[PDB]
Amino acid sequence: TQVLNGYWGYQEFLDEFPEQRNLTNALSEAVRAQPVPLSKPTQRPIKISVVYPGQQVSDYWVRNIASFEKRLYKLNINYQLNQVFTRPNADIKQQSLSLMEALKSKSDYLIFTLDTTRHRKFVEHVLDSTNTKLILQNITTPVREWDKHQPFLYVGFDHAEGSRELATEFGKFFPKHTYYSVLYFSEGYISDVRGDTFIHQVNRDNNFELQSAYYTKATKQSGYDAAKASLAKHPDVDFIYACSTDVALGAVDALAELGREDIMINGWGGGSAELDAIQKGDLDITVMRMNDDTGIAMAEAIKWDLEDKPVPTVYSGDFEIVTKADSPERIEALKKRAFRYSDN
Amino acid sequence: RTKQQTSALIHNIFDSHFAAIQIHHDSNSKSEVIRDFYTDRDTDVLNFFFLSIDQSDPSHTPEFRFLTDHKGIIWDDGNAHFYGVNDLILDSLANRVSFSNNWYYINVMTSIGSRHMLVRRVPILDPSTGEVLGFSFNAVVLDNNFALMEKLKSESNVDNVVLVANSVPLANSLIGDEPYNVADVLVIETPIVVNAVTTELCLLTVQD
């Protein structure tokens, strides 16, 4: 069985290149531990450029840069940081003009958070035609096309890893042949790696039987609609697996309306809305990102590079399972860990 | 020097064969006929439907197809049988292909020899609710694929071509009355690479 897909899985990559697993594990350990300052001072401050999407309602990227900068400081790395923002709805010509700002700084490291398919020309230009070291965020599955020359670092919270942790928990709690339904994201990548990964594992390890599955429009409304449609046609399920936050919270409302709170349901990601729902007992389980890990990891990778140590190609931040049985003390402790740098 | 342009041409013909089948598979899977089949299960209406699409573009059809719901296979077109792909092997193919919209290379033994296949699935959707009713599978069988070898030779204007997997020939375009046979060929080697995944497959072309 050889899937002919253009990306390495995260675990697949670490298995194909065993030394990469050792490097990734060392980075994981350094990220959790207290800072160990740079042991090889630089003659000048390093130049870093970061490309973020503008006009974001969430503070995900604000926290990310806060965590990155704080770790650099605590590691005694002198730097000059240039931030570059693209307009999400602008066309490709306009965004590519904005990205010139990232090249004008003549960076030693360029951190890039935008989609690498849409902006493939830019990222391949950085790899093929510049002397900066490219760090990609929101991707943990190395591009096979770049096998001969990979970016300096890929970071993110791997979708398959998070989904497998959820599959393991569902597998422990429910007996073999348990009936379940799945609410996907919209058709595409997220549904493939969060949804079909989960289905594959619980079917293989626990013999669970999928009763129904629905693609959604990735909104609370569509998750609500899909849950109602699913339960009208397939009421005899013990849980629903949801691939995203808003979809899950829509299904939660559907469960309350139908008086089917006996059906267990998960979140995905563990943000503030989910954790509120967990504490109310509206969501039964979720997988929570330790947000600040990726910002800290990028700083540690740079440190190792400045110390002439080998740096892993890929890194996925830590996840923690959270359930409605967890105490408020436990959830607060997880929040403080996830935001250990970006808070305050 | 000129080994490069020949390799790129035959790999483009190879890719275009599967891209065309992929495009039909996606479009056929949106069809109202297949969706209605999940309810009434009328094999005669379904078979006539697939006969008509294959008529228009005969070269770009799969060697076999089958449909599943979430429990298992509910229909196959009957073509798998003579390839040695029995019902238990079909069930295994359905289990192995666990992601949609992606070709899988599968090399599996049967009672009548090894079968080297490219297989993919697409979800069958209810356009109004988003329900996944099940999956549609398409399989290309590479072994002794007369039509495919003939198309690779014809469109690349080379004299002949042999498909190989780990130095064992799977198919060839040789008519039979030429100065050489397949074993003698085993001039240009072209590894089959799909989405930058290296496979055990190789295309051997004869230009001299």
d(CA A124, CA A126): 5
User: C-alpha angle with apex A295: A293 to A298, nearest 5 degrees?
Assistant: 105
**B92 lies within 8 A of chain A by CB:** no
Asked whether residue A151 falls in the same domain as residue A201, the answer is: no
What contacts B175, CB < 8 A, 6 or more positions away? Answer: none
Coil, helix or strand at residue A242: strand
A85, A98 in Cβ contact below 8 A? yes
SS (H, E, C) chain B: CCHHHHHHHHHHHHHHHHHHHHHHHHHHCCCHHHHHHHHHCCHHHHHHHHHHHHHHCHHHCCCEEEEECCCCEEEECCCHHHHCCCHHHHHHHHHHCCCCCCCEEEEEEECCEEEEEEEEEEEEECCCCCEEEEEEEEEEECCCCHHHHHHHHHHHCCCEEEEEECCEEEEECCCCCCCCCHHHHCCEEEEEEECCEEEEEEEEEECC
Q: Crossing angle of helices A18-32/A293-306, nearest 10°?
A: 110
Under 8 Å between Cβ of A63 and A293 = no
Q: How far apart are CA B23 and CA B9, in angstroms?
A: 21
Q: What phi and psi, each to the nearest 5 degrees, are found at residue A87?
A: -90, 115
Q: Give the residue from B52, B57, B51 showing the smallest Cα distance to B77.
A: B51
Contact of A84 with A97, CB cutoff 8 Å: no
Same domain flag for A19 and A145? yes
User: How far, in Å, CA of B204 to CA of A66, rounded?
Assistant: 56
Q: How many residues does chain A have?
A: 344
Extract the tokens encoding A124. Answer: 């391949």
Q: By residue range, what is the domain housing residue A198?
A: 159-289+319-338
Total domains, chain A: 2
Q: Does B128 touch chain A (CB under 8 A)?
A: no
Put simply, the answer to whether A214 touches B132 (Cβ < 8 Å) is yes
Cβ-Cβ contacts under 8 Å, B70 against chain A? 209-213
A/B interface, count of CB pairs below 8 Å? 76
- Given B100, B106, B130, which is nearest A226 (Cβ)? B130
Under an 8 A CB cutoff, do B197 and A4 touch? yes
Q: How far is CA B178 from CA B157, B162, B164, B168, B188, in A?
A: 16, 14, 20, 21, 18
Check whether residue A99 and residue A228 sit in a common domain: no
Closest Cβ opposite residue B195 in set A1, A144, A225: A144
Q: Cα–Cα distance between B202 and B163 in angstroms, integer?
A: 6
Q: Are residues A82 and A231 in the same domain?
A: no
Rounded CA gap, B196 and A149, in Å? 13
Q: Residue A316 in contact with residue A160, Cβ under 8 Å?
A: no
Angstrom distances, CA of residue A198 to CA of A110, A194, A241, A249, B119: 34, 6, 8, 19, 22
Contacts of B44 (CB under 8 A, 6+ apart): none
Tokens of A58: 């969430």
Residues A27 and A84 in one domain: yes
Residue type, A280: K
Q: What is the spatial distance between Cα A253 and Cα B15, in angstroms, rounded to a whole number? A: 47
Which among A1, A147, A222 is the nearest to B106, CB-wise?
A: A1
**Distance spanning both ends of chain A, measured CA to CA:** 49
Residue from A230, A237, A248, A243 nearest A195 by CA: A243
Q: Is residue A287 within 8 Å of residue A321, measured between CB atoms?
A: yes
Q: Distance between CA A7 and CA A12 in Å, rounded?
A: 10
Q: Do B104 and A1 touch (CB under 8 A)?
A: yes
Topology given in CATH for the domain delimited by B1-157: Beta-Lactamase (3.30.450)
Q: Residue type for A75, please?
A: L
E strand residue ranges, A113-185 = 133-137, 153-156, 179-183
How many Cβ atoms are within 10 Å of B65's Cβ, its own excluded?
18
Residue-by-residue DSSP string for A169-196: HHHHHS-TT-EEEEE--STTHHIIIIII
Whether residue A148 is found in the same domain as residue A217: no
CATH of the domain at A331: 3.40.50.2300
Element spanning A109, H or E: strand A109-112
The full set of domain ranges for chain B reads 1-157, 158-208
Same domain, A99 and A173: no
Regarding whether A312 and A224 lie in a shared domain, the answer is: no
Specify the DSSP class assigned to residue A17.
S
Residues A2 and A92 in one domain: yes
User: Into which CATH architecture does domain B158-208 fall?
Assistant: Single Sheet (2.20)
Q: Residue A129, SS3? A: helix
With contact defined as beta carbons under 8 Å apart, do A291 and A64 qualify?
yes
Q: In the numeric block, which tokens belong to residue A233?
A: 């046609």
Q: Are residues A123 and A68 in the same domain?
A: yes
Round to whole Å and give the CA distance between A303 and A307. Answer: 6
What burial class does residue B31 get, using C-beta atoms within 10 Å of its C-beta: 0-12 exposed, 13-18 middle, 19+ buried? middle
**Encoding tokens for residue A66?**
């806060």
Q: Hey, is the C-beta of B166 within 8 angstroms of any chain A C-beta?
A: no
What resolution does the deposited structure have, in angstroms? 1.9
Angle between helices B32-40 and B43-56 (to 10 degrees): 160
The CB-side HSE value for A151 (13 A sphere, CA atoms) comes to 29
Same domain for A42 and A186, yes or no, is no
Secondary structure letter of residue A247 according to DSSP: H
Q: What is the C-alpha separation between B56 and B61, in angstroms, rounded?
A: 10
Q: Which residues of B touch A6 (CB under 8 A)?
A: 195-197
Same domain? A18 vs A144 = yes
